[PDB]
C-alpha cells in the first residue's frame, strides 16, 4: 500500500492503496498533510468535515503536496500469509512485526520550489525544475535520514510489474524515465527496529507522483 495525494479532476485527495485500487486515507493515520506554494511557502490544509475534501484555495496554488502517514503496526501468526494491522504483542502466534510509515509527495506545478527537500525520513526529491515531457528522464535524489541513499531502488508504478527498479547511483541520484500522463515513483525500505515491543522491523515507503506534459 502507498499513501499519496492523487491529483484528480475533482481536486487532490489522500489515498491509501495502489493506483488502480485505492481508498481514502483514514484521518487517524495522517500525521501531517500540507502544500508548498510556487515560492516555497508552506500552506496548511485539512480535509473538510462533511465532504472529506482538501481546500480548493490551497489546491489551486499548490506547487506540491506532502503527506506523512503512520500506517501503524502489522503482524500475523506463524503459518499465515496476510498481515493484519495489529501489533505482534496482541496477535497470538506472531513473533515478528512491522511499524509501517508512508510518505508521499505530489507535484502539481513544476518550478524551483519542488526541488527543496521536505525532511521526510525517506524522500524522493526531484532534481528537475521543469514540467517533464513523456520520454524525458527526470533526475531525482533519494534521501534517507536527511542524507543521500546510494543504491535506492526506485519503482515506476505505471510500468509493467516485471520491470527492474531504477537503481540510484553512488550519490543516491537516478535518471528516471518519464512516461505519459499521471505517474508514481516509489522507494521502500524495511529495516530492523530495536526498542519497540510491538515491532522488530520498521517499514517505510515514499512516493513522488507527477503528471507529464
Ligand atoms: Ni499494498
Author numbering: 1 to 213
Text of the article:
These searches return sequences of proteins with an N-terminal histidine capable of coordinating a metal ion. Structural and spectroscopic analyses confirmed that these proteins bind transition metals (Cu²⁺ or Ni²⁺) via N-terminal histidines.
Based on this evidence, we selected a DUF4198 protein from Ideonella sakaiensis (WP_082368692.1, “IsDUF4198”) for recombinant expression. At a 1:1 protein:metal molar ratio, the greatest thermal stabilisation was observed with Ni2+(ΔTm = + 7.0 °C), followed by Zn2+ (+ 4.6 °C), Co2+ (+ 4.0 °C) and Cu2+ (− 0.2 °C). The IsDUF4198 protein was co-crystallised with Ni²⁺ and its structure resolved at 1.4 Å resolution using molecular replacement. The IsDUF4198 structure features a cleft measuring ~ 12 × 20 Å, which houses the metal-binding site. Unlike the canonical T-shaped histidine brace seen in LPMOs, the three nitrogen donors in IsDUF4198 form a facially capping arrangement around the Ni²⁺ ion. This coordination geometry likely underlies the protein’s preference for Ni²⁺ over Cu²⁺—a notable inversion of the Irving–Williams series. Adjacent genes included TonB receptors and NikR_C family transcriptional regulators, both linked to nickel metabolism.
